[PDB]
Amino acid sequence: SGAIYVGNYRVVNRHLATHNDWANLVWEDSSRDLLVSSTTAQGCDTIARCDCQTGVYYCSSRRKHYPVSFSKPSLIFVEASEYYPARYQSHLMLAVGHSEPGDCGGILRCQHGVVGIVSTGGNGLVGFADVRDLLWLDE
Numbered sequence: 609s610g611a612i613y614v615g616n617y618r619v620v621n622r623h624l625a626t627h628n629d630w631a632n633l634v635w636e637d638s639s640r641d642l643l644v645s646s647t648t649a650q651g652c653d654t655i656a657r658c659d660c661q662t663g664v665y666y667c668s669s670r671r672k673h674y675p676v677s678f679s680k681p682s683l684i685f686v687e688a689s690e691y692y693p694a695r696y697q698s699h700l701m702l703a704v705g706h707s708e709p710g711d712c713g714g715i716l717r718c719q720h721g722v723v724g725i726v727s728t729g730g731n732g733l734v735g736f737a738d739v740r741d742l743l744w745l746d747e
């Protein structure tokens with residue numbers, strides 16, 4: 609689990625969005641596994657605006673943060689789970705690292721701010737849904 613709080617928005621994995629997230633829907637993209645809902649409280653996370661390929665992510669299944677190198681956001685085939693059939697996921701970044709399903713929502717951060725959230729994984733790889741292109745999160 610996990611979310612990003614920036615301005616009047618909450619960014620979550622679309623497969624983990626709650627009934628309240630869907631009732632306050634701002635934008636969602638199934639191919640990205642992202643959903644953004646509106647909030648009453650102002651959030652103060654900072655979204656990175658950069659092309660970094662190194663950063664640190666939180667891994668709840670190890671209670672640890674790990675530094676990784678990751679690929680630029682791209683269209684990648686992702687195997688099925690109970691939440692989606694196998695399909696191409698867009699704006700996905702991969703790194704070598706540990707993850708389990710419940711690690712979704714863990715934040716990846718570089719020196720500039722939040723890069724994305726854990727979304728996929730397996731075989732020693734962890735995939736992150738990028739948020740750096742969503743310029744509207746700051747306005």
Ligand SMILES: Cc1ocnc1CCNC(=O)c1nn(C)c2ccccc12
Pocket residue numbers: 623641686687688689690691692697707708709710711712726727728729730734735
């Ligand atoms: C976005 C997406 O695509 C398909 N199902 C999902 C959503 C469900 N995701 C997973 O099942 C999953 N997430 N991570 C980090 C893992 C690590 C090891 C094994 C499985 C997973």
Ligand SMILES: [Zn+2]
Pocket residue numbers: 656657658659660718719720721
């Ligand atoms: Zn950066």
